[PDB]
């Protein structure tokens, strides 16, 4: 082989470097150099990446999303729900777990909605997908490790998060329980995702514990590929077949 990681059929890989897919899409504060989003034909990811979820958590159907994204030769990041629309909620929260230069911060593409004043009005919002193409929407639920934490951040305790489309019908509630601390936090965030079709409407409703997307991703290419795990970087070369050790250019 060449020993080089090359563009495949003229289209480069997505180069995540030290970030995971969830880190990149959620906007881990440390993945802001990946916003170049060049058109890609495969995804290049370091094995056992570091810059994943800065706030400990899990991502549902993560493997299915990782598979989906290998086909997405290109995304347009679209500001679906501007964070300044939630005029009755605090949209300025964060965590020391995601801190930048010592100050609390958060995933860049999402809004941690917490209580304003003395309450948490039911948070609502929607989007009719008039962007011209199918969109990937990611959102999540915050699971406190205490009752005190639930009340301090959301006012209400018996809360739920409900999301749906013409095909999606999903409802969940927070799990408040003692957990081991990961990255300093006993709390966990759970992320979920869906694809909103054209002209369909996604409706969000919450009485607490909602992490709302600010941005979604428009998927416009629809091909097929995989994820290559390697510690190297892209070189200015081209191939027909690529392995983790470098590209292969043969007829055998």
């Amino acid at each position, epitope marked *: 082989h060449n020993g080089k990681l090359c563009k495949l059929n003229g289209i480069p890989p997505l180069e995540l470097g030290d970030c995971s897919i969830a880190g990149w899409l959620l906007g881990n504060p440390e993945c802001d150099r990946l916003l170049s989003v060049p058109e890609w034909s495969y995804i290049m990811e370091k094995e056992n990446p570091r810059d994943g979820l800065c706030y400990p958590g899990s991502f549902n159907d993560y493997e299915e999303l990782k598979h989906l994204l290998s086909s997405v030769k290109h995304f347009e990041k679209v500001k679906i729900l501007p964070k300044d629309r939630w005029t009755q909620h605090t949209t300025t929260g964060g965590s*020391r777990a995601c801190a930048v230069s010592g100050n609390p911060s958060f995933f860049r593409n999402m809004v941690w909605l917490t209580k*304003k*004043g003395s309450n948490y009005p039911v948070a609502k919002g929607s989007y009719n997908n008039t962007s011209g193409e199918q969109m990937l929407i990611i959102w999540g639920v915050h699971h406190p490790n205490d009752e005190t934490e639930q009340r301090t951040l959301y006012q209400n305790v018996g809360t739920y998060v409900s999301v749906g489309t013409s095909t999606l019908n999903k409802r969940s509630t927070p799990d408040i329980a003692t957990r081991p601390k990961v990255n300093g936090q006993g709390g966990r965030m759970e992320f979920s995702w869906t694809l909103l079709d054209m002209w369909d409407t996604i409706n969000f409703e919450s009485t607490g514990n909602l992490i709302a997307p600010e941005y979604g991703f428009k998927i416009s290419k629809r091909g097929s590929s995989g994820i290559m795990k390697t510690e190297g970087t892209l070189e200015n070369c081209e191939t027909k077949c690529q392995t983790p050790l470098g590209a292969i250019n043969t007829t055998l």
Partner: antibody
Amino acid sequence: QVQLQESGPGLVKPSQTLSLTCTVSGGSISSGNYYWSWIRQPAGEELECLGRIYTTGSTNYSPSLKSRVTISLETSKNQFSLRLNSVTAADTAVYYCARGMDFGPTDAFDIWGQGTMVTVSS
Amino acid sequence: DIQMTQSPSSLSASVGDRVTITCRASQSVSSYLNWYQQRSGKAPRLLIYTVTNFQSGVPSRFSGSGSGTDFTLTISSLQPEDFATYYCQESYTSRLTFGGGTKVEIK
């Protein structure tokens, strides 16, 4: 309901070690997303953070104190303690035990103890 | 590190008066500003834990407002129970510093 109770008052000489122990009751010090700190208040002055210890054992100390102050966590007794080495007259103050809430969006001192007076003099 | 300023250093008021206390950050601290009520001889009590969000047990007369660098604590109608020194704290930075403290005096 969680309470923080400091050890009693006293007088120490310059170059001695200040030692205050906070007993936590109503729950475990290793239980939630909390941190403990000691806050000093010289009479007539502003509240000062001396330092913090996290439930996970991580610590942070203020620049004027870090070369002198140690804070530690004892899980088996639900206790925290403040050790200040090389005390001087300027360290005469009320020392409070406080429980901070480490919730991402909210960071505040929720529970305060009563405050123990420590005098440093010749 | 962010420097705090708080004013008036003191202000008197009658019972029933509207009272406002101003807290200013030298740099933005977003919404991470809390407030405390200290009675003389006692440890400080938390009133506001994030701007505008008050602690359970805190009378509804205590209403926070503001953002970034300029914040206000408003007592809608001063009570005999409120003659205290109020402090603001910026928890955005690693040093969780406090402002000077504003004394509310009896008129």
